[PDB]
Amino acid sequence: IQMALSVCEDLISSQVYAILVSHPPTPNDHFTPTPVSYTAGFYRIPVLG
Amino acid sequence: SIGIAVILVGTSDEVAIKDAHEKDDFHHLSVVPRVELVAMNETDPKSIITRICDLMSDRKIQGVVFADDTDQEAIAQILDFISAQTLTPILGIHGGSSMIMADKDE
């Protein structure tokens, strides 16, 4: 939940044209890029995993 | 009693909407709906996330009803994400929140 707050209040404002997805500490987890690709996909910002 | 909050963005009259707020003849069962009228310009995701997740801290509510009068093409998708991350049901009523979507999270 804090990902959307942290990503768009600290990263998109710094004039970023490409964002790289992190890696989950536990491989069986899933929600590493699912908050990143939602908020960053609003403004048609390319995201690389 | 579970508080129900309604949020609308655009040009509207607060008194006209609030006239029918306490008008549900629900005397059959003691629902006691504490309807709260909330008006804020929250088109951007930042305003939504800083308001939706702060409402529970102030007022104990387990239900949110959202309305809008804008032609946004992706407001429904970004608003649906809060439902996936929580267990509080939310209903899209008016505007872009009522636009169609392909699928929802389980």
Burial-class residue B56 by CB neighbours within 10 Å (0-12, 13-18, 19+): middle
What Rg, from alpha-carbon coordinates, does chain B have? 14
Report the amino acid identity of residue B31.
Answer: V
- B27 belongs to an annotated ligand binding site: no
- For residue B37, the number of C-alpha atoms closer than 13 Å in the C-beta half-sphere is 11
Nearest chain A CA: its distance from B81 CA (Å): 9
The amino acid at residue B29 is L
Question: In B2-91, which residue ranges form alpha helices assigned H by DSSP?
Answer: 14-19, 45-58, 75-85
Q: Give how far A32 is from chain B: nearest CA, Å.
A: 14
Nearest residue on chain B to A43, judged by CA atoms?
B74
- Give residues with Cβ within 8 angstroms of B2, minimum separation 6: B33, B34, B61, B62, B63
Give the closest residue to B71 by CA, choosing from B104, B96, B49. B96
Which method was it determined by? cryo-EM
Residue pair A33/A2 in contact (Cβ under 8 Å)? The answer is: no
Is B45 in contact with A8 (Cβ distance < 8 A)?
yes
Which residues contact residue B48 at a Cβ distance below 8 angstroms, ignoring those fewer than 6 apart? B42, B78, B79, B82
Identify the residue among B57, B75, B81, B86 best suited for mutation to test binding to A, counting A beta carbons within 10 A and taking the highest: B81
How does strand B3-8 pair with strand B36-39? parallel
Residue among B46, B52, B91, B84 at smallest CA distance from B68: B91
Buried b (16+ CB within 10 A) or exposed e, A15-45: eeeebeeeeeeeeeeeebbebbebbbeeeee
Closest CA to B56 of B86, B19, B26, B92: B86
Residue type for position A4: A
Phi/psi at B97 (5° precision): -65, -20
Q: Token pair of A17, please?
A: 């044209």
C-alpha dihedral (B60, A8, B7, B4), degrees to nearest 10? -20
Chain B residue with minimal CA distance to A7? B46
Q: With a CB-CB cutoff of 8 Å, which residues 10-39 of chain A face chain B?
A: 38-39
Per-residue three-class SS string for chain A? CHHHHHHHHHCHHHCCCCEECCCCCCCCCCCCCCCHHHHCCCCCCCEEC
Specified resolution (Å): 3.3
